[PDB]
Amino acid sequence: SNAASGTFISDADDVVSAMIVKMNEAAEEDRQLNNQKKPALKKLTLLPAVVMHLKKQDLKETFIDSGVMSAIKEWLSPLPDRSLPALKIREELLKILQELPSVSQETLKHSGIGRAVMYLYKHPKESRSNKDMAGKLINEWSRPIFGLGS
């Protein structure tokens, strides 16, 4: 056993990093499941499990640095079948993306999360309610303000 004698944050960081990893593994597993034409739902079984961890706004720093934005981006990414069973999962994930504090625009750009959101936002099969939060995200993740407006 140990006690605090300086920074005690360690166990929490390992868990956040492991969560990013598990999200990635579930995203890759869905690719393999699809390769065998079996139902791919690993992101779905892991959905309530990630939400419990993703809501740890206290650990915002580790989540952003470990690249949760990249793992969420792959969860939004569907199989080559173009069906989007990820819809049920995205209902929670979109919200979590708006709970982020001051993630740099560079992170959104590098992870490609903005592109993943835009893909679904412009997707013709998608519902208005889910698109609203997708549109909000594109707005709050730096409006491009080209000009000719108020």
Side-chain angles (χ1 to χ4, degrees):
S1 311
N2 63 331
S5 184
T7 309
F8 199 76
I9 303 171
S10 303
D11 304 88
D13 202 283
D14 279 314
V15 170
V16 170
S17 295
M19 175 48 75
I20 268 83
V21 171
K22 258 60 190 150
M23 288 157 69
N24 273 305
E25 307 200 76
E28 288 233 61
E29 268 200 293
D30 276 354
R31 307 293 180 187
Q32 302 201 53
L33 291 164
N34 205 235
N35 204 345
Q36 306 210 37
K37 285 69 61 174
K38 307 304 185 184
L41 295 171
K42 293 301 187 104
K43 298 168 184 182
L44 206 135
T45 194
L46 186 42
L47 184 267
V50 308
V51 169
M52 183 177 68
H53 294 86
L54 294 201
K55 250 80 210 314
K56 301 290 179 181
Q57 298 178 335
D58 190 45
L59 308 169
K60 47 115 218 316
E61 41 207 67
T62 312
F63 268 114
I64 293 165
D65 194 68
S66 301
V68 76
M69 308 311 291
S70 303
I72 296 162
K73 156 261 191 186
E74 273 307 305
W75 276 35
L76 268 58
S77 184
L79 287 308
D81 182 65
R82 312 171 190 82
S83 293
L84 312 175
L87 172 59
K88 294 190 178 184
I89 297 138
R90 280 153 41 205
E91 295 201 297
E92 293 275 68
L93 293 176
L94 289 156
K95 303 191 290 187
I96 273 124
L97 288 158
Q98 332 212 335
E99 302 194 349
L100 293 166
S102 306
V103 56
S104 67
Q105 299 304 316
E106 298 168 301
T107 306
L108 291 357
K109 188 70 175 297
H110 279 236
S111 57
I113 186 68
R115 186 183 179 181
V117 170
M118 189 190 78
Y119 157 63
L120 297 159
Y121 184 56
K122 303 301 185 68
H123 200 253
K125 303 290 187 69
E126 282 300 331
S127 66
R128 291 192 181 187
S129 332
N130 196 274
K131 281 182 182 182
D132 188 70
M133 306 196 295
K136 279 168 56 60
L137 271 175
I138 297 163
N139 225 45
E140 72 203 62
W141 287 332
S142 197
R143 306 188 85 208
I145 312 298
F146 302 114
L148 222 302
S150 56

